[PDB]
């Protein structure tokens, strides 16, 4: 009874989604028990329908039942606060943008053309779409901020940023990485390069409106590519790394912060197929990072894991 459960497990995602999307989850903070009848009235939902949804959520262990009402389980508490990796994943991923594409994914395999499953559906690139769909961009940036904040602590321990002067984050969106590093390391020129509609404003953090497919600005002694190359096939990844080498002098260092694919890595493997669907891209093994680095004329000096799924790679021009 494993296979049928794997196939129908999507309904649990969908049930969690409707509970978040209808704005009900916000009422379940501090494991507080809430009355289904009063919740139905607040949002003008048929109690009968809302009680049946809650019964399904009880069976999948999301909600717990009492004579006081229903509350979120200890394991599913994070549905309460909007700024959790769980809540923001529901907002970012559970929508037509991904689910229309997942349905088109089997066609993108059979029709081997330059179009990703997403491109076939939307008729644009994923990042071209985010320019239009503003709500999804803010959700994307919010989810990416959480994955940045898991890393800052071990990143600041493992790598020495204090030795550098000028730092450039290639594709750093809202400069969360650099904002968080600037918090624990002062006396540094922090700059973020990314394709912006409106350039983000800060103090101490510089924001360039550029493109890493065009020659990258010189002067920087530290370049960073955090969760970028996994959005680009080998030929496009090489293009980005070639421009990095050209922009780098002898002493300059390139930091790759990525989800490292390992023979045992479910979390990284599920995201691998997601990157294929969206960008026709992938997560890469250590050997695959060297392959694209060697073709760009860069050499791997250091590689170390930051946590269970994230890793760091130091590349220098040699």
Residues at the site binding ligand SAH, with contacts judged by CB under 6 A: 127, 144, 148, 171-173, 176, 194-195, 210-213, 226-228, 231
Q: Which tokens is 72 given? A: 């979120």
Burial of residue 51 (number of CB atoms within 10 Å: 0-12, 13-18, 19+): middle
**Residue 295 touches which member of ligand SAH, a copy of itself, none, C-beta under 5-8 Å by kind:** none
Provide the minimum distance between the beta carbon of 7 and a copy of itself in the complex, in angstroms, as a whole number: 5
| Residues forming beta bridges with residue 170, ordered by sequence position | 193
Nearer Cβ to a copy of itself, position 92 or 190?
92
Nearer Cβ to a copy of itself, position 221 or 234?
234
Provide the minimum distance between the beta carbon of 176 and ligand SAH in the complex, in angstroms, as a whole number: 6
Pairing of strands 253-259, 310-317: antiparallel
**Residue 176 touches which member of a copy of itself, ligand SAH, none, C-beta under 5-8 Å by kind:** ligand SAH
**Residue 6 engages a copy of itself in binding (rule: CB under 8 A):** yes
**Residue 94 touches which member of a copy of itself, ligand SAH, none, C-beta under 5-8 Å by kind:** a copy of itself
**Residue 52 engages a copy of itself in binding (rule: CB under 8 A):** yes
Nearer Cβ to a copy of itself, position 74 or 203?
74
Sign of CA dihedral 307, 116, 90, 8: negative
Provide the minimum distance between the beta carbon of 81 and a copy of itself in the complex, in angstroms, as a whole number: 12
* Whether the Cβ atoms of residue 254 and residue 316 lie closer than 8 Å to each other: yes
As a whole number of angstroms, the distance between CA 96 and CA 114 comes to 22
**Residue 231 touches which member of a copy of itself, ligand SAH, none, C-beta under 5-8 Å by kind:** ligand SAH
Nearer Cβ to a copy of itself, position 73 or 125?
73
Nearer Cβ to ligand SAH, position 70 or 151?
151
Nearer Cβ to ligand SAH, position 21 or 141?
141
Provide the minimum distance between the beta carbon of 149 and a copy of itself in the complex, in angstroms, as a whole number: 15
**Residue 1 engages a copy of itself in binding (rule: CB under 8 A):** yes
Q: Which tokens is 7 given? A: 């196939």
Pairing of strands 253-259, 298-305: unpaired
Residues 82-111 that bind a copy of itself (CB under 8 A): 85-86, 89-90, 93-96, 99-100, 102-103, 105-106, 109-110
CA distances from 99 to 112, 117, 121, 144 (A): 20, 10, 10, 20
* Whether the Cβ atoms of residue 212 and residue 232 lie closer than 8 Å to each other: no
Provide the minimum distance between the beta carbon of 171 and a copy of itself in the complex, in angstroms, as a whole number: 22
**Residue 282 engages a copy of itself in binding (rule: CB under 8 A):** yes
**Residue 46 engages a copy of itself in binding (rule: CB under 8 A):** yes
**Residue 119 touches which member of ligand SAH, a copy of itself, none, C-beta under 5-8 Å by kind:** none
The 3 state secondary structure assigned to 290-312 is HHHHHHCCEEEEEEEECCCCEEE
């Amino acid at each position: 009874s494993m296979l049928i459960d794997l196939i129908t497990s999507y309904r649990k995602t969908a049930a969690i989604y409707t509970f978040v999307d209808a704005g009900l989850s916000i009422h379940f903070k501090n494991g507080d028990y809430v009355d289904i009848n009063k919740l139905a009235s607040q949002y003008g939902i048929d109690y009968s329908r809302l009680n049946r949804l809650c019964d399904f959520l009880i069976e999948i262990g999301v909600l717990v039942s009492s004579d006081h009402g229903v509350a979120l389980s200890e394991e599913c508490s994070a549905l309460a606060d909007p700024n959790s990796v769980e809540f923001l994943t529901v907002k970012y991923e559970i929508n037509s943008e991904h689910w229309d594409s997942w349905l088109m994914y089997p066609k993108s395999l059979l029709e081997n053309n330059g179009k990703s499953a997403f491109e076939m559906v939307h008729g644009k690139s994923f990042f071209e779409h985010l320019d239009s769909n503003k709500g999804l961009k803010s959700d994307f940036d919010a989810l990416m901020s959480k994955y940045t904040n898991k890393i800052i602590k071990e990143l600041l321990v493992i790598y020495d940023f204090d030795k550098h002067n000028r730092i450039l984050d290639l594709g750093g969106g809202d400069g969360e990485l650099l904002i968080r590093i600037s918090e624990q390391v002062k006396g540094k020129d922090y700059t973020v390069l990314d394709r912006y509609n409106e350039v983000p404003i800060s103090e101490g953090i510089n924001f360039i409106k550029g493109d890493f497919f065009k020659p990258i600005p010189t002067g920087y002694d530290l370049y960073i590519l955090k969760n970028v190359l996994n959005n680009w096939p080998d030929n496009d990844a090489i293009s980005i790394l070639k421009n990095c080498r050209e922009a780098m002098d002898n002493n300059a260092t390139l930091l790759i912060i990525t989800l490292m694919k390992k023979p045992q890595s479910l979390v990284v493997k599920s995201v691998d197929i997601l990157m294929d669907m969206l960008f026709s891209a992938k997560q890469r093994y250590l050997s695959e990072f060297e392959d694209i680095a060697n073709q760009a004329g860069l050499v791997i000096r250091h590689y170390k894991d930051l946590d269970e799924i994230f890793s760091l790679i130091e590349l220098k021009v040699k």
